[PDB]
Amino acid sequence: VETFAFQAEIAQLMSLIINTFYSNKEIFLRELISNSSDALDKIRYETLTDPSKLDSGKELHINLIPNKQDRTLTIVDTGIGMTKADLINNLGTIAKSGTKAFMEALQAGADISMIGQFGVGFYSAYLVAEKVTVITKHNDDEQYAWESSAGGSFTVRTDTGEPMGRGTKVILHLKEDQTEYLEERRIKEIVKKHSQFIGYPITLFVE
Numbered sequence: 194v195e196t197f198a199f200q201a202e203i204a205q206l207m208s209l210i211i212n213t214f215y216s217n218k219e220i221f222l223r224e225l226i227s228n229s230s231d232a233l234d235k236i237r238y239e240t241l242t243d244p245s246k247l248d249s250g251k252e253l254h255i256n257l258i259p260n261k262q263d264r265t266l267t268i269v270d271t272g273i274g275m276t277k278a279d280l281i282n283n284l285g286t287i288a289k290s291g292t293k294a295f296m297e298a299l300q301a302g303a304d305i306s307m308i309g310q311f312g313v314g315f316y317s318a319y320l321v322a323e324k325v326t327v328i329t330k331h332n333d334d335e336q337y338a339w340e341s342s343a344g345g346s347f348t349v350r351t352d353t354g355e356p357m358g359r360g361t362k363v364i365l366h367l368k369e370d371q372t373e374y375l376e377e378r379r380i381k382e383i384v385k386k387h388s389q390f391i392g393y394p395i396t397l398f399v400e
């Protein structure tokens with residue numbers, strides 16, 4: 194297990210997400226599904242010129258898996274995935290510059306729900322999660338698990354035993370008071386409200 198420090202601006206963005214009073218928490222799901230869609234577009238685009246990019250899985254989809262017993266909500270996609278280097282470099286985002294633009298925007302009237310416009314929507318997972326695990330497999334690398342309970346650091350390790358083939362899985366270990374996000378009717382409402390036109394099938398698993 195390797196332990197990394199978040200760059201200062203990311204640590205500050207995370208602290209802001211965790212500590213700012215902001216009721217409209219549900220937007221985290223739209224931001225994660227939007228990230229899954231972008232990654233799925235990327236593998237789709239690569240496959241248009243190289244069909245073999247799909248040998249690791251032809252199906253392009255997003256699954257939402259709540260688990261009341263573990264208190265987790267997991268989002269799985271069969272997108273391009275990330276290499277170990279992408280994971281370390283802020284989950285493939287331009288987080289340092291994005292965070293600055295997000296800050297400047299906040300001071301100009303913007304609210305937390307606009308996070309995705311600054312390329313750092315991933316971090317909105319911390320509105321509802323005490324811990325986030327990102328398991329990912331890209332065609333050019335092995336399967337890795339990134340993890341962070343915030344606090345200024347994240348870990349990266351090799352992941353084994355449940356190979357995914359290709360894609361990203363985001364496991365949200367929910368805060369005690371945010372279990373509404375495990376409820377079928379609540380998830381469906383949020384998907385319908387914010388993710389109605391996503392170009393990939395979104396399957397909500399039942400328990």
Ligand SMILES: CCNC(=O)c1n[nH]c(-c2cc(Cl)c(O)cc2O)c1-c1ccc(OC)cc1
Binds near residue numbers: 224229284315360
């Ligand atoms: C190097 C190519 N890989 C990717 O771009 C990628 N792969 N998986 C993801 C991904 C990231 C998160 Cl946070 C997520 O919730 C879902 C994803 O598929 C992404 C991804 C990375 C950054 C993004 O910034 C908006 C959006 C999606």
